[PDB]
Design a binder for this molecule. Structure first.
Ligand SMILES: O=C(Nc1ccc(-c2nnn[nH]2)cc1OC1CCOCC1)c1cccc(CC2CCCCC2)n1
Ligand SMILES: O=C(Nc1ccc(-c2nnn[nH]2)cc1OC1CCOCC1)c1cccc(CC2CCCCC2)n1
Length: 190
């Protein structure tokens, strides 16, 4: 399967017209989160492609690791990786891993959806986070999402994440059997 990793922007009301970008320090008291959250595209509920495997506060931000598990999405993305000139137009020519490159380029942003900070003052009643989205627009923080077949390879691409932080992150990513997760709701047009 495919793993995704990166630092998140923390966003409340991601779809709404008033976009709030939270400071990490407002939500770190509610991390880590090791239970799976949906991974969608641009905060659209019907575009679930995978599940988060961990959200962790690290020295230099909030790091998310996840798996892309939708077979319909994986088949579509692989076919585009090998056959779509459009998908490959903004990628360097003739990459060895076109699928990884196309996802890295077209979906570079990871946004973590949170409740309003009004609710983070004192003590929230229900879950603080709702999902993570793969995003093309709205990126504030630096660094970009990395996609790979090997979770350890993905996390090790981030120099700002230490070997100690990487090991803590990977403890939870490997313990899960991706086959055990429910099938995301993404449907391919084809
Ligand atoms: O070729 C593309 N799409 C496409 C184009 C022809 C068809 C098609 N073939 N025959 N009939 N329709 C089916 C398509 O599927 C789309 C269905 C909905 O999710 C996106 C993909 C394309 C090109 C550049 C960038 C993107 C964006 C993706 C988002 C995730 C994966 C990496 C890039 N997509
Ligand atoms: O969801 C997407 N595409 C998509 C979604 C359902 C279908 C569909 N519905 N029924 N059959 N196919 C077919 C789709 O792709 C076609 C429609 C759009 O452009 C070409 C192909 C999507 C999202 C973000 C970025 C892009 C890549 C752009 C798209 C615009 C042209 C330049 C590149 N595509």
């Amino acid at each position: 399967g495919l793993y995704v990793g990166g630092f998140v922007d923390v966003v409340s009301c991601p779809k709404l017209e008033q976009e709030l970008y939270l400071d990490p320090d407002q939500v770190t008291d509610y991390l880590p989160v090791t239970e799976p959250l949906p991974i969608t595209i641009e905060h659209l509920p019907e575009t679930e492609v995978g599940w988060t495997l961990g959200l962790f506060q690290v020295s230099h931000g909030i790091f998310c690791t996840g798996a892309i598990t939708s077979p319909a999405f994986l088949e579509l993305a692989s076919r585009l990786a090998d056959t779509s000139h459009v998908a490959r137009a903004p990628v360097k020519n003739l990459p060895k891993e076109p699928l990884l490159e196309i996802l890295h380029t077209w979906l570079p942003g990871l946004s973590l959806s949170s409740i309003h900070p009004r609710e983070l003052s004192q003590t929230p009643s229900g879950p603080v986070f709702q999902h993570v989205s793969l995003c093309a627009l709205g990126r504030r923080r630096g660094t970009v999402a990395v996609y790979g077949h090997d979770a350890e390879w993905v996390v090790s691409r981030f120099s700002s994440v230490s070997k100690s932080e990487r090991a803590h992150i990977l403890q939870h990513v490997s313990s899960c059997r991706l086959e055990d997760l429910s099938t995301p709701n993404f449907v391919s047009p084809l």
